[PDB]
Every structure is written in structure tokens, then in C-alpha cells.
Amino acid sequence: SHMLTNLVAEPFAKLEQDFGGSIGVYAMDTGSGATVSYRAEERFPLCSSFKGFLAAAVLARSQQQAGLLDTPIRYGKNALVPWSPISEKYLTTGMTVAELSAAAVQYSDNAAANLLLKELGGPAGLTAFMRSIGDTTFRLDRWELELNSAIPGDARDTSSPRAVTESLQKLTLGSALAAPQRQQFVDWLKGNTTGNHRIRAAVPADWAVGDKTGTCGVYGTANDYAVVWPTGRAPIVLAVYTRAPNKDDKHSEAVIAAAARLALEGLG
Numbered sequence: 580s581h582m583l584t585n586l587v588a589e590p591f592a593k594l595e596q597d598f599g600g601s602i603g604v605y606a607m608d609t610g611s612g613a614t615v616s617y618r619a620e621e622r623f624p625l626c627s628s629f630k631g632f633l634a635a636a637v638l639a640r641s642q643q644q645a646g647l648l649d650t651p652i653r654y655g656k657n658a659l660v661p662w663s664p665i666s667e668k669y670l671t672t673g674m675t676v677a678e679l680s681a682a683a684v685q686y687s688d689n690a691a692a693n694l695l696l697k698e699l700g701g702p703a704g705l706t707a708f709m710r711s712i713g714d715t716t717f718r719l720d721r722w723e724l725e726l727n728s729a730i731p732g733d734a735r736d737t738s739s740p741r742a743v744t745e746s747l748q749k750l751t752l753g754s755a756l757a758a759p760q761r762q763q764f765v766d767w768l769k770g771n772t773t774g775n776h777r778i779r780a781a782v783p784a785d786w787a788v789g790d791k792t793g794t795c796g797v798y799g800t801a802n803d804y805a806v807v808w809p810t811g812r813a814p815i816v817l818a819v820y821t822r823a824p825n826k827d828d829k830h831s832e833a834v835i836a837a838a839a840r841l842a843l844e845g846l847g
């Protein structure tokens with residue numbers, strides 16, 4: 580589908596010129612097979628958007644570990660990382676593995692993320708899971724909050740919008756997860772609360788959307804990926820990532836939404 584990529588090439592370049600940074604977009608229409616690419620193979624910092632794959636990784640481990648999702652996890656005050664709005668409310672009680680996973684996806688809870696990263700063997704364990712579903716691009720290298728440095732040219736804690744999309748499609752529509760675990764992942768993504776102004780702001784009001792956002796902040800680095808379900812039609816999977824050369828460059832949610840629109844425009 581080289582035709583549709585060329586259709587939106589000039590609009591995408593004008594958008595990233597207005598933003599003053601780089602924009603990486605990949606989108607595939609599972610109803611036709613048409614794809615749109617713009618910097619889709621370049622590396623962008625994952626930021627918080629890794630927590631979606633972190634939850635899918637926990638779901639795959641629950642398959643051969645029955646009752647993993649129900650295992651209570653108690654944690655002290657030192658386990659609290661800045662921006663842990665869900666975990667700091669159960670500090671005196673604890674939470675379940677499934678609760679921590681839903682908090683990491685839907686609220687980007689950081690203490691919950693590090694607690695789950697520890698459950699999987701650290702960032703290498705999550706990287707191991709993505710390789711095991713066919714993703715050779717994804718890599719996680721550090722924990723919260725070190726993974727958010729978004730240093731120009733640093734491949735640590737990065738993936739490509741295409742690999743993100745391809746892996747998201749495998750885990751939400753393909754066979755990387757079993758039918759029970761697949762629906763829970765889609766359900767966790769559908770209930771995300773942090774993405775109202777990104778991909779969700781780019782789709783019609785009747786579309787069902789599951790997404791996970793990321794906001795390094797520095798270097799104008801923010802992102803969003805989603806599986807969107809048009810009414811009575813096959814779903815589209817897409818990923819939109821941005822970065823910028825200067826540490827104090829500001830990210831733009833509006834730019835992310837506008838990029839999600841141009842990709843849907845490219846696919847129809």
C-alpha cells in the first residue's frame with residue numbers, strides 16, 4: 580500500500596513542521612489491508628505507553644499460572660513512585676495483580692507498573708515477552724521513572740510506531756493472547772482515562788476505542804496507540820508518536836490527534 584502513504588506525505592510533513600519536531604505514524608485497516616506509514620520505522624521513546632504491553636505480558640503469564648490475576652500484592656510506602664493515584668489509595672491494604680495491571684493501563688499508575696515489572700523479571704522480562712510474539716523492535720531498558728528521559732538518539736525504552744501497531748494487533752485481534760485474556764486486555768484499554776484528547780478526539784462519536792497514552796514531557800515526546808472499532812466495520816489499529824530535538828520542547832496532544840485524523844483520512 581505505497582499509494583496511501585504517499586497521499587498523506589505532504590500533510591504529515593506540514594503537521595510536523597508546525598509542531599517543530601518529528602511525528603511517527605502507522606495505521607493498518609484490518610478490513611482491507613491498507614496501511615499508512617510516516618516515520619513508522621523510526622524509534623520513538625515509549626514513555627508510559629509500555630504499560631499497555633506490560634499488562635498484556637501479565638495476561639500471557641496468567642495463562643500457565645492460574646490465579647495469577649487474583650494474587651494479592653502488598654507493598655510499603657517506599658514502593659510508591661510519583662504519580663501513583665490508584666496505588667497510594669490501597670497503600671494500607673494492597674491490591675491484586677489484575678488490579679495493578681488495570682491501574683497501570685487505565686491510569687498509568689507508576690508504583691503499580693514497577694511492581695508488575697518486578698513480577699515479570701524487570702524490563703528484560705517484558706522485552707522477552709514482545710520477542711516471543713514476534714516483535715524484534717520493542718525494547719524496555721529501565722524502570723519508572725528513568726525510562727522517560729527521551730534522549731535524542733538513545734534507543735533505550737523505544738519502539739517504532741509500526742512495531743507498536745503490529746504487536747497491538749497481535750495482542751488485541753490476533754492470537755498472541757488466548758480468547759479470555761485477549762478480551763480483558765481490550766477491556767482494560769477501552770477503559771483508559773488518560774487519552775480523551777489524542778486518538779479518541781480524532782474518531783467519530785460512535786466508535787469504540789481502546790488506547791494507551793504516553794507522555795515523557797521532555798523533548799516534546801508524547802504518544803498514543805489504539806484499536807478503534809468503526810460501527811459495523813472491521814477495526815483499525817494505529818500508533819502515533821512524537822519527539823523533538825530540544826529538552827524543553829513541549830509535546831502537543833492536539834498534534835497527536837491531528838496525526839490520527841490524517842492517517843484515518845489516508846485509509847478512508
Ligand SMILES: O=C(Nc1nnn[nH]1)c1cc(-c2ccccc2)n(-c2ccccc2)n1
Binds near residue numbers: 661662686724725
Ligand atoms: O508518560 C507519562 N504519563 C502518561 N502519559 N500518558 N499516560 N501516562 C509520564 C508521567 C511522568 C511523571 C510526571 C510527574 C510526576 C510523576 C511522573 N513522566 C515523567 C517521569 C520522569 C521524568 C519525566 C517525565 N512521564
